[PDB]
Design a protein around this ligand. Sequence first.
Ligand SMILES: COCCCNC(=O)c1nc(-c2cccc3[nH]ccc23)no1
Ligand SMILES: COCCCNC(=O)c1nc(-c2cccc3[nH]ccc23)no1
Ligand SMILES: N[C@@H](CCC(=O)N[C@@H](CS)C(=O)NCC(=O)O)C(=O)O
Ligand SMILES: N[C@@H](CCC(=O)N[C@@H](CS)C(=O)NCC(=O)O)C(=O)O
Ligand SMILES: [Mg+2]
Lengths: 198, 198
Amino acid sequence: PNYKLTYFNMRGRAEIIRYIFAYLDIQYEDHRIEQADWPEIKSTLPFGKIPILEVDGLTLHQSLAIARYLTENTDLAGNTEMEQCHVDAIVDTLDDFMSCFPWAEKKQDVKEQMFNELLTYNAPHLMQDLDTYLGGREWLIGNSVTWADFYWEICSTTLLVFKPDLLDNHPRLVTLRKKVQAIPAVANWIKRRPQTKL
Amino acid sequence: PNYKLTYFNMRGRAEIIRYIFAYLDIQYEDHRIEQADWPEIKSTLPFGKIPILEVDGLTLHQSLAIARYLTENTDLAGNTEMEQCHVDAIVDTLDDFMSCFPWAEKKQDVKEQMFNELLTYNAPHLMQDLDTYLGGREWLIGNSVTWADFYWEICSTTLLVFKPDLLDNHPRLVTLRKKVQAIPAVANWIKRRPQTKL
Ligand SMILES: COCCCNC(=O)c1nc(-c2cccc3[nH]ccc23)no1
Ligand SMILES: COCCCNC(=O)c1nc(-c2cccc3[nH]ccc23)no1
Ligand SMILES: N[C@@H](CCC(=O)N[C@@H](CS)C(=O)NCC(=O)O)C(=O)O
Ligand SMILES: N[C@@H](CCC(=O)N[C@@H](CS)C(=O)NCC(=O)O)C(=O)O
Ligand SMILES: [Mg+2]
């Protein structure tokens, strides 16, 4: 099975897919494009959005649909049917927040204002909600790591770029981040991946 | 199982779950709230959003996470892992767009202008994409109805309230809506359900 992942040269929405490839030890082409190459790719796509993942000549889309597909019937999926639901819910909650950010906003002052508002007013409540949900458990869902723990680490890493103090009052969330970063395949990918701001 | 769904008295984000319950002939309590009991209830919710689904003492959240869980091991979900990925992707593409609308905006002129903007530029672009993706095939994914077909009928039913002419040059998408509506269990539900604008 031949894999080609296309995205911008950044972690962004594609990183969850990259973590999953790493963990499952699957080789793939990590295709990263410039903004100036985007329009000619975009015009050929069914839905005009990245990331996309090509598998044996079939173009998949939607970052989380792809991540869910790649983890189905692996240990990164929930351990029960209910656990898979919890995984999906946490992932969407995180995605809902990250999606609020005006990432492609060209007017810098308007962009700054919004980032500031979401990070100062909204991000702290999500952290609180996540902290209580985790409680004293080892992973977000069940007794072993799921791709929701992956997604938490990935989202939180980007949020900490803009707001370094985000988890000062949430040591158990920091512990979860660190636990994720300690998984051998993930540590390895973290070590060797392209370093970009986002 | 003792299923209890909580949402506003409206179709909204809960409707997909209601279609699935109806189609799979799964009994549930359809609890609807006024604003009166909203800020009250918004407290015991671990994430303060609806819909939620209570199943034997567990409060589940995220409308699409719940929907997917209920489709588990049925033809409705997609017939292969790959089809399930297509179903998940279409649903997320739809949800991404519906999420763009300022549903709660209190300034009536701002709301009107944003709705018009989205329905004039974004919606026709997405419609061309959806139409070409479906082609002259029977269903969006595979040889039989999936919950992605359900979600398309659901999202478009609401969009048509605001722009009645939205599908006037998309007969294949109209045909899809009609095919979904005439599925007996869906036809039964659509007649039985409370009449609300949204
Ligand atoms: C022309 O657009 C360039 C791509 C801009 N996108 C970003 O900068 C970016 N998006 C996300 C993002 C969005 C939604 C969910 C997410 N989860 C993790 C990152 C992320 N992070 O960075
Ligand atoms: C006090 O706040 C209540 C906001 C009222 N909400 C709506 O009218 C609404 N419907 C939808 C909706 C319907 C179908 C699919 C959807 N996907 C995302 C939102 C949505 N979203 O908001
Ligand atoms: N919900 C989708 C969103 C995909 C998306 O909108 N990606 C952005 C980049 S992060 C994009 O394609 N922007 C360029 C464009 O819209 O033309 C997903 O997770 O894949
Ligand atoms: N992505 C979530 C969104 C949940 C959501 O934002 N619910 C809406 C109801 S349409 C809401 O206004 N929640 C209550 C609130 O935020 O006050 C889902 O699909 O379940
Ligand atoms: Mg989503």
